[model samples]
Target chain A: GDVITQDTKQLPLTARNFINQYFSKPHISHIKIESEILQTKKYEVLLTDRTEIDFDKKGNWLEVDCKKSAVPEALIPVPVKEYVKANFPREIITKIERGRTGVEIELGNDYSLKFNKKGKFVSMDD
Target chain B: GDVITQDTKQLPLTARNFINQYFSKPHISHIKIESEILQTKKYEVLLTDRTEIDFDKKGNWLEVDCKKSAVPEALIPVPVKEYVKANFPREIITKIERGRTGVEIELGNDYSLKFNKKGKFVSMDD
Candidate 1:
């Protein structure tokens, strides 16, 4: 899993298309990738800006962590976005990561939040 | 994992060759298979005589469980067989299963045995 490479040829077609569809920023083209097949395939890629993208077996993203930038608008579910906006208007979503069980988010105010898959806020993480 | 099949063409080459090597029984050519890719590929197969075989990505079997018939003598590690022979002379090894961490075996007498990958007996499951 520690193996990482930047060669596009080594990436699966699904991964290539995922970047094209989401990042859209031409300047953010260069990315580093690491993959492992642990019963199922998992990919973790680091974008030029330090955003980390993780994908599950079917090529759907499980997590996207953009260090200090807002995640793409299209990626955030409406209910989750709305909840964040309503409660913390001054803070920007610096990172958003999720797995089958839950989602975690980082904010500009240095607050980290946790939520269940259902979009219900569970608690705060340090 | 729910999918069950017996098509040899669907079997990966490594798995096919494995069958040829370990199970020389001519009548046992047919098998049912279920495979899943988690982070890696794992295969579970049921042989005609209630024998259950499991394999990891590289097609090395992790488990071979036969309800009554002896597992192929070659597959049993010498030490494991020796331990079974010395202690449970009256009991027959009905099943043998293992993962990265440990091994489990079922007996004709309704007792289950566990061991570390090193073949040292740990305890009885039931």
Candidate 2:
């Protein structure tokens, strides 16, 4: 079972403010503000374009999951972008998760890639 | 003049926690936790090595200034690092400021470089 909750109101000011700083306003279909006791609370914003974004409690981003569509071009790290372009030119990055120690990315073909926090490629998988 | 203040004791839990997450603690020489009314309050931690780091009120980093020393390599954006290596291999990045829309870096030779938030090189100066 999973503990999930629907957001009852607009985003918290911090989260809204953080979005304003980077992303241009796109229509937001809904947001999931889940605060499961076992985990740190976070915001899951789903844009009309089906892009999913996760934000920490303090409103800093933790992940961007675009599913099939490529994530924003400008947001991709240069090394990551170059690696994928050189190695998997046909595929697009569908998701990216920024961790404290590393970054994980998902490709259109279901390939997963790992990189150090600085975005240096470490490994890849099918 | 400038509005500056010294931080007594240690950092706030959030700031200390953030440093612990990304940085191996070097001996902290002192911290300048200044709150000027006209500006957002921030913490400036000066390490014994003279590396200076600035963090926002919420503990997220805003800048890293290493003076004449190169910034920790892993922290430099890949595009920025590569561009510097390709164009100015003899110089090192001494400071980096992360703004909402772009990044600004100072090189050892007193050159300043600008990059869009995405880390693509935008311009350079002597």
Candidate 3:
């Protein structure tokens, strides 16, 4: 009853290619993808883990308090950004957010690129 | 170059605990976490898939067209919402967005809880 559908019509060709190439993979088990329009007229994407947690005998779920790490901007090869710009010229990159295990890219068009810490892309559209 | 960082100072105790618990698993590899402050003053979190796609003999990357699914609101026990509210009174749940495989929770404070289709939590802060 709580289903959400994303609009992909505005997605640029290069963005789509990036999604098809760099983002999609099957190695990781659980995956999640989300995108939203921001006030800055940019888009954002988010990637997350979806593994189920098992309860221990104490009826408590185990906690894995892992610290987050950031993805360096330098690592995002110019080719990738150039690819994104060439395809989605209207879309501007506001920022790239990274953690110990995950990364989020904020776009000027309110679009975001979310990836798992391992660097896989998760699709929000079904 | 792209580098991203997330803020966790505003996270609620339950949310923190949830992050500490549900969002902190190790099964599914690659992990990414993201959060944002919306115009509504609510914070949003997005989880995505970060698997690396490999190129085939054709020099083209393989595409995985996995559809997203929604998580029923009914499945989100009242206890959980109550827990979030009791712990974070100022926070309001605007809506819960579900995709073919991922989920995003929009809050009145402009905050959202994003999860991978598999139901694991992704952290935007590294």
Per-prediction TM-score, please?
A: 0.35, 0.36, 0.19
Question: For candidate 1, what is the TM-score?
Answer: 0.35
Off by over 4 Å in 1: A1-126, B1-41
Chain A TM-scores for all candidates read: 0.60, 0.66, 0.31
* Candidate 3 iRMSD in angstroms: 22.7
Q: Put down candidate 3 lDDT per residue, A1-126, tens digits, no spaces.
A: 122224433333443454444333313332222233332211111224432222222223222212133222343436446555575676655445445556555555556665565556643221
> Taking the tens digit of each residue's C-alpha lDDT, what string does model 1 give over B1-126?
344343546544544443344222312233333244444324444433445554444545556666687766555667788888999898788777766768777788878888898879889855
Q: Which ten contiguous residues of candidate 1 chain A have the minimum total lDDT? A: A25-34
Superior candidate under DockQ, 1 versus 2: 1
Whichever of 2 and 3 has more lDDT, that candidate is 2
lDDT of 1 by residue, A37-57 (tens): 444324444443555554444
Candidate 2 per-residue C-alpha lDDT over A49-77 given as tens digits, one digit per residue, 9 for 90 to 100: 55555555455556778789777766678
Error of 3 at A119 (Å): 3.7
Model 2 C-alpha lDDT per residue in residues B1-126, reported as the tens digit of each score: 122223423344444343334323323334433222333324444444656555555545567787888877776789988998998988889998888878899999899999998889888888
Query: Model 2: DockQ against the native?
Result: 0.01
